[PDB]
Amino acid sequence: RLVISIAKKYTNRGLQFLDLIQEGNIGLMKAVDKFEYRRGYKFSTYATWWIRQAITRSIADQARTIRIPVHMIETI
DNA sequence: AGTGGTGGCGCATTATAGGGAGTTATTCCGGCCTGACAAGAGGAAATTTAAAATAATTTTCTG
Numbered sequence: 307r308l309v310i311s312i313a314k315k316y317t318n319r320g321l322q323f324l325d326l327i328q329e330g331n332i333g334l335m336k337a338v339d340k341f342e343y344r345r346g347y348k349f350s351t352y353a354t355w356w357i358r359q360a361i362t363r364s365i366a367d368q369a370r371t372i373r374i375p376v377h378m379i380e381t382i
Numbered sequence: 383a384g385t386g387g388t389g390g391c392g393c394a395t396t397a398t399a400g401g402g403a404g405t406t407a408t409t410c411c412g413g414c415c416t417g418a419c420a421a422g423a424g425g426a427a428a429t430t431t432a433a434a435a436t437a438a439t440t441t442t443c444t445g
Contacts (some may be wrong), residue, residue, distance in 0.1 A: 348396065355397085 309334055312357050319365045326361060333360030 309330035314325055337356035339351060366376045 346395070351396065 308353070309357065312354060313361070316361055316365055320369045321365055325364075329361050329364040330357050333357045338358065 309327055313323070313326045313330050317323065321333065333338045333356045334353060340356070341352055363376075366379050367373055
């Protein structure tokens with residue numbers, strides 16, 4: 307449910323909700339496999355971080371038909 | 383009048399941005415081949431003038 311909770315943010319960037327939740331699942335798995343409890347870092351933040359890092363990356367890249375650099379998106 | 387509470391700083395934790403490294407892909411820099419000019423040579427068509435002949439003018443001779 308955490309992935310679902312964070313996903314509902316990105317809900318209008320030309321992306322089927324389910325694709326969003328899927329990208330979030332990939333990011334969460336990546337965080338879990340990379341999560342470090344011994345490095346000294348709040349687990350939940352680490353997770354959510356990766357979640358966003360994946361979701362925003364996916365929307366930036368595959369949202370628009372003509373793919374556009376991400377810094378350009380930030381400019382917009 | 384004392385024990386706790388408040389604020390500020392410290393310690394520990396948390397979050398965010400920039401820089402370095404890579405990597406790709408566009409873009410500048412240089413040599414070398416095309417392309418243009420200037421010249422030179424040998425041989426051949428064209429043009430011009432001089433000389434030689436037919437058809438007309440002038441003079442002379444004949445009827």
